[PDB]
């Protein structure tokens, strides 16, 4: 186990006046010429500082996001 995972990027960029870099193959002569998928393997990292923020954010044990099932408990279940 090396911590590496595939980062997939979906660029649907019709109408974008930004130089195109990355793709080096033939043109389609349609909208696909303004769209690209990118894949790379990269080590996924999470900082201790973000982890600490998350611990604090989760420590109410009560508030979810909007319009989702509620599964919170006040007792230790496992």
């Amino acid at each position: 186990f090396d911590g590496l995972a595939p980062y997939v990027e979906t660029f649907n960029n019709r109408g974008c006046e930004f130089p195109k870099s990355g793709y080096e193959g033939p043109a389609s002569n349609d909208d696909n010429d303004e769209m690209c998928v990118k894949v790379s393997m990269l080590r996924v990292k999470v900082s201790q500082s973000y982890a600490a923020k998350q611990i604090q954010q989760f420590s109410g044990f009560k508030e979810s996001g909007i319009d989702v099932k509620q599964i919170s408990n006040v007792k230790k279940i496992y």
């Binding site: 090396d2 010429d33 894949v39 909007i66 319009d67 496992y78």
Partner: protein, 174 residues
Amino acid sequence: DAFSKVITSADGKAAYVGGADLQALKKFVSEGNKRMDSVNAIVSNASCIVSDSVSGMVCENPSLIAPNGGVYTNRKMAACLRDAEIILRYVSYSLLSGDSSVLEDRCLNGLKETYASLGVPAAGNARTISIMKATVIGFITNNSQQKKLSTPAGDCSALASEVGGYFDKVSSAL
């Protein structure tokens, strides 16, 4: 092939599929355009998917951030958030490629034994995965509060079933 070369390079080199190669890719996988939108719904929501899945694991069992709990320290929480993202990203690649081979061989192979040796709670992983699965399916099927990705309105239930299967492979393995 193009993606397996970068997956085995394991060194940050990128593969790019645009233009005619992308038009072709979308002919060789089922529901090519909808499949790219489904992938987009994972990768553009990656941070909130991970956070909500771990947060729900924790609100269901607050003892996970009590002293000695599975994610009590910043170090352990960081590892857990990391793993959730790793798994989510392998699922995203499974959806891009229409195949779970890389997820199984590079992510899930040995993972259960690893968690058993570290004491990582199987019930916590089970809940995190179930929420990640539901969240991804929600974004793909417009069941989410936010609909920030503009798509043509249609039925993506087949892709939602497929990605659900990939999460179910994770759950099975763990």
